[PDB]
Amino acid sequence: TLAVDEIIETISAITPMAQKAKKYTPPAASMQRSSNTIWMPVEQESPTQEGWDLTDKATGLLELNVAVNMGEPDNDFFQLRADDLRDETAYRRRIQSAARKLANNVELKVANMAAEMGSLVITSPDAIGTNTADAWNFVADAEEIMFSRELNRDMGTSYFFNPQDYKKAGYDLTKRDIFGRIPEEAYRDGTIQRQVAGFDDVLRSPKLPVLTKSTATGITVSGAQSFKPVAWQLDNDGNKVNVDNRFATVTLSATTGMKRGDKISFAGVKFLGQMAKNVLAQDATFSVVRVVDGTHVEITPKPVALDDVSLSPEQRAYANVNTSLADAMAVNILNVKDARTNVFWADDAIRIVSQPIPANHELFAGMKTTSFSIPDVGLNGIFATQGDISTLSGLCRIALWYGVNATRPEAIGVGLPGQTA
Amino acid sequence: ENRLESILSRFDADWTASDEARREAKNDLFFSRVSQWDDWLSQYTTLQYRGQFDVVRPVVRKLVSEMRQNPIDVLYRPKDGARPDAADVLMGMYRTDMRHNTAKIAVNIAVREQIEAGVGAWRLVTDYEDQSPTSNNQVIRREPIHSACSHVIWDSNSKLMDKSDARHCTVIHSMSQNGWEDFAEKYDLDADDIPSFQNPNDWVFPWLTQDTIQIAEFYEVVEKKETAFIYQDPVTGEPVSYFKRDIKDVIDDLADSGFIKIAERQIKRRRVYKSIITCTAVLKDKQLIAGEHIPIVPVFGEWGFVEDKEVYEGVVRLTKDGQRLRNMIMSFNADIVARTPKKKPFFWPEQIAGFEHMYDGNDDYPYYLLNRTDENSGDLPTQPLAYYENPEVPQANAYMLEAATSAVKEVATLGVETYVFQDNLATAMRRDGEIYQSIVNDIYDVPRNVTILMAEVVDLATGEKQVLNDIRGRYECYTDVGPSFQSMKQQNRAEILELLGKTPQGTPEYQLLLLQYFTLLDGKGVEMMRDYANKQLIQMG
């Protein structure tokens, strides 16, 4: 047989999302004896009272916090053997492909976490190729919902299209019967523009998920509930333990058909202006993050009501919805058709918390361990090898440890076109 | 149309053009530095004996020592019709900034790689130094390049050994994580955006892995006609300066100082731009660097083109087959010595039944006893005792080991002497001298010699920056090859001694001896001797 070892390359993957998401590496000893979690405070909001006589009406102080943790390592444990000759060049090819697949995995979980914890939902009743300039309309709707809520976008904003909708936007640009500079660029290259409708980074991503329709219907809030901004609470032993701020557990009539990633909205509640607390004309949207029990769920925008009388003034200072739940409100489901997602966020919402695996220690003898830098994603793992003469074989393992965290789910959004019927 | 696209197209063309030679050179480096058993499957599965009995390394060591005992360096000589001391200032600058350890180390690294693989290289960079500057708060240093065969990719359309016709060149930097952090800090890059590039090394034969970071620097040369200004020097003569060099800083400060523009000419010159690149983005676009030539100097061994394909070779490429054969034969023979039953008798058990303790190895008995009878067969059948044959090295193994060693010895003769390799190194040093002259004319303050003293014509802008002014009478000296001296004083001492060697014992012998005493180092006794020599030389006029 004649043979040449030139590789025929078949995969060219790209990593925009994990490149844009900031990487965080807290101290290792502190994480080790704190169970791989760390808390960060949340920007403080102040209540206001107008009047002359304010006796006994002095407020307190309340400063909430959120928690970032990690998961479990992702590996490429594959065994080495004799087999055939080209095993030793497939060895290096396997190491490279393993690093590349690890980078892909980080991206996939970043995109999935964004698409499943994104509170803001921008739906459309038709596809993107139907009307003219409606891709711009979609991006502008994203920007406007970020602007009206007075959300922080200082470090940047980003809008990722999926390739189908990116092509449809480019088609909208090139069918314009006029060539200036934007249509000429969209003609020669496929790119619409680097900044559209306000966003300062508009990209396309091929790893954006598809949000399946939820068959859930006829679901109403069961019992009037009020959720309160707290910073800690007492356990059974009296110890004050911290409370994560981006999660509220609501009781509904029945959780049949819902799943992590579902976008809902309660019939009647409206968004606020956060800083000014002015009622918006857009319905408040939430995203479910976990179905607990058969009648409870967990939704990531904690619905602090403005009109809730049982809240302390310092807690009402954190209100983001005009009305509380009322034991009968319908739970509208925003995702009614299967659709690939477009995802936008403020650039500081998603982070990647990374920790090392100290397998280079003296306690690991017999195995040879090096650090393993991954390109694209800015991450570091370990590469470990152990030779076992007993079967006269060896084992190879590339282990990367990290966790993707969404600190501000209210800043991450999703764009669902063609949500008709 | 993309600048990134054009850079990558040129780089990919060169990378595919230089593929066989780079693989062979990396093979030579790995063979002559790490191990001669270029294998992974056999020495990781079913472990056998693999010796290493070198015959090529002593040859490589002898060649390296021979090239180390004969150093070579640039020597600037005045042109034809120019003043006899036109190269003195340039030579002094060169000897000042090339005396450091890094210059010698870079040359030695390049020479060793030239001997072993077939190609080496080094680089000439410029830095800012405040404490001890060569000139203009700047220094020029020489830096090494390790594994130039794979780390320096040249323009494919170059048919010159010293690569003077290369329109571009890409140098691949692989550095640790801390190295990348410091590189980004120095080059104003983003340390958080880890870069990637085509990995030059291969790290096959696992050797664990290579925890590195790869970036590239892409040098390109642009030869064009650009504007020059003809002024009227307030002291004397008409100086020519380039428009781009004084475009904004001192374009009016020259007139303020007193220069009056006389004419404006367009002159063709070369410019060099460096770009920091990664596989997916460009970081620094066209940062103009000083000089007219690419600051990378390559050194070659046996170099040529076969069919529009470059081939270079050292001394190790043609010894590999014989050396590998010798190693294999010696390993086979070692196996024969170990795993072989040795010479012992063959017995039937009934022959020694009851007498087994006599044959174990002790010397407590005067003779060996054997059985004679069997109850059924009557007597033990007669047959002379057999002994297992001694281990033997086959005539095939012996003959082929001798023949392989003889072939390696025959083929590992570079020349008859390293004259051709030293001549290639002299070519590299002449290119080094040319590059250094260009960069000196660009960044250093070069005074002019007048027969009416040395004059420096310079001025400072409103931003307190001094703008050097070099007239076009710059290439007044050419480059030759000479002995490596640490200073101009040492060079003058060598010249005086050489002249004294051929001068007979007349009056110029006394003259040159007094000159030698004048140009000596200082102590107390040598101080008095040099003062006496000065007195004599002054008193004889």
UniProtKB/Swiss-Prot annotation, chain A:
Interacts (via N-terminus) with the capsid assembly scaffolding protein (via C-terminus); capsid proteins and scaffolding proteins form building blocks that assemble to form the procapsid. Interacts with the portal protein. It is found in: Virion. Keywords: Capsid protein, Late protein, T=7 icosahedral capsid protein, Virion. The keyword Iron-sulfur does not apply. InterPro entries: Phage_coat_Gp5. Belongs to the P22 phage major capsid protein family. Its main location: virion. This is Major capsid protein. One of its GO terms (biological process) is viral procapsid maturation. The insertion domain (I domain) plays an important role in the folding of the capsid protein by acting as an intramolecular chaperone. GO terms for molecular function: identical protein binding. Gene3D superfamilies: 2.40.30.240. The record marks D5 as: Essential for binding to the capsid assembly scaffolding protein. Changing W232A: Cold-sensitive phenotype probably due to an assembly defect. Changing D237A: Lethal. Complete loss of procapsids assembly, assembles as tubes instead. The record marks W52 as: Involved in capsid stabilization and maturation. The keyword Cell wall biogenesis/degradation does not apply. Changing D5A: Impaired phage growth; inability of the mutant capsid protein to interact properly with scaffolding protein. Self-assembles to form an icosahedral capsid with a T=7 symmetry. It comes from Salmonella phage P22 (Bacteriophage P22). Residues 214-336 are annotated as: I domain.
Swiss-Prot record, chain B:
Its main location: virion. This is Portal protein. Belongs to the p22likevirus portal protein family. Keywords: Capsid protein, Late protein, Viral capsid assembly, Viral genome ejection through host cell envelope, Viral genome packaging, Viral penetration into host cytoplasm, Viral release from host cell, Viral short tail ejection system, Virion, Virus entry into host cell. Forms the portal vertex of the capsid. This portal plays critical roles in head assembly, genome packaging, neck/tail attachment, and genome ejection. Procapsid assembly may initiate with a nucleation complex composed of portal and scaffolding proteins. The portal protein multimerizes as a single ring-shaped homododecamer arranged around a central channel. Switches upon genome packaging from an asymmetrical conformation in the procapsid (PC-portal) to a symmetrical ring in the mature capsid (MV-portal). This change of conformation may serve as a signal for headful packaging. The chain holds residues 5 to 580 of 725 of the full protein. It comes from Salmonella phage P22. GO terms for cellular component: viral portal complex. It comes from the Viruses. Homododecamer. Interacts with the terminase large subunit; this interaction allows the packaging of viral DNA. Interacts (via C-terminus) with the head-to-tail adapter protein gp4; this interaction participates in the head completion. Interacts with the scaffolding protein; this interaction initiates procapsid assembly, thereby ensuring incorporation of only one portal ring per capsid. Interacts with the capsid protein. It is found in: Virion. Coiled coil: none annotated.
